[PDB]
Amino acid sequence: LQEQMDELLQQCFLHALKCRVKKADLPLLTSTFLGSHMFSCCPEGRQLDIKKSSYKKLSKFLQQMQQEQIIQVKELSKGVESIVAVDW
RNA sequence: UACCUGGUUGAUCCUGCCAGUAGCAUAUGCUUGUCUCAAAGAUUAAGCCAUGCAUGUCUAAGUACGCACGGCCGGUACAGUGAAACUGCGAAUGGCUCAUUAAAUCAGUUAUGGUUCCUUUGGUCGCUCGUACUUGGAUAACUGUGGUAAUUCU
RNA sequence: ACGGGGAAUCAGGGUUCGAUUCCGGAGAGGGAGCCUGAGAAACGGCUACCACAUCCAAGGAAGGCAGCAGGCGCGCAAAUU
RNA sequence: CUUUAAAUCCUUUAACGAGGAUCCAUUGGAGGGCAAGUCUGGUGCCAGCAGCCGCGGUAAUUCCAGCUCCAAUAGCGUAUAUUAAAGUUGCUGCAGUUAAAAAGCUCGUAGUUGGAUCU
RNA sequence: GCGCAAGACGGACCAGAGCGAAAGCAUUUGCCAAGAAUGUUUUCAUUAAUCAAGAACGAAAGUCGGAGGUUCGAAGACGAU
RNA sequence: UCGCUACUACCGAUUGGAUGGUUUAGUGAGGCCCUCGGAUCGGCCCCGCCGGGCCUGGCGGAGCGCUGAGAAGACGGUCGAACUUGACUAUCUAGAGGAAGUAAAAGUCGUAACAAGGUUUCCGUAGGUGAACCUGCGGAAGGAUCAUUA
Beta carbons of A37 and A46 less than 8 angstroms apart: yes
Q: Which amino acid is present at A78?
A: K
Nucleotide nearest A78, CA–C1', reads: F94
* Residue pair A25/A84 in contact by the 8 Å Cβ criterion: yes
The three-class DSSP label of residue A43 is strand
The sheet carrying A81-85 orders its strands as A27-29, A81-85, A71-75
- Return the DSSP state at A51: G
Method of determination is cryo-EM
Resolution (A): 4.2
Q: What is the DSSP letter of A45?
A: S
Nucleotide nearest residue A60, measured CA to C1': F16
Q: Which residues are within 7 Å of strand F by their Cβ atom?
A: A 29-32, 34-35, 49-51, 55, 57-59, 61, 78-81
β partners of residue A28? A83
3-state secondary structure of A74: strand
**DSSP character for A64?**
H
